[PDB]
């Protein structure tokens, strides 16, 4: 019958970030260094672009050095970058208003505050 | 106490910006030749979607030339799978989409609707 077939794949999406996520860990096809507290976290340009405008401004015109400033603190970033490349946010009551502050700050998309 | 939230749309929307980076040409840092002409791309989406761009990438500006088996026509509507999780097929495409598929060993698509074109 058929002349047309639009063919969507419910996994591939969950599957790229997976993929990304495990790059990152693995330090592996990373472009950018953001530093926090002194430390280093290591990720992708695009994907910090695609889920922050902070990054989009500080990364869009360019390896790559960002720094964030005192504001952003680990114990607030890292929840972040981990939801960045997971769609899972994990707060507790220790973390939350860390968290809260860097994603106004970093402008951190599709969040339910 | 914990809230941990999941957002079963958030892969979507990452998937979503990288895909509007690719038309844009913004962000890029991978060229794809294929029967003479330039596809622009991420290397870490290729590789995270494709065995064979992933040996392609992995160790190494970045310039790939796919042989003469891969065709614009096969190509085009899988990178744009890759970026948009959508393939659309048809009788015109689909010998050329599945080959190509084989050939790239791109990942997350069931063959079995190779079949209905």
Do not use: W
Request: charged share 25%.
């Amino acid at each position: 019958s058929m002349s047309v077939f639009a063919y969507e794949s419910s996994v591939h999406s969950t599957n790229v970030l997976l993929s990304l996520n495990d790059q990152r860990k693995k330090d592996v096809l990373c472009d950018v260094t953001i530093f926090v507290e002194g430390q280093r976290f290591r990720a992708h340009r695009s994907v910090l672009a695609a889920c922050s405008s902070y990054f989009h401004s500080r990364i869009v015109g360019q390896e790559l050095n960002i720094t964030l400033p005192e504001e952003v603190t680990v114990k607030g970033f890292e929840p972040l970058i981990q939801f960045a490349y997971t769609a899972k946010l994990i707060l507790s009551k220790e973390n939350v208003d860390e968290v809260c502050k860097c994603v106004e700050f970093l402008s951190v998309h599709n969040i339910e505050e």
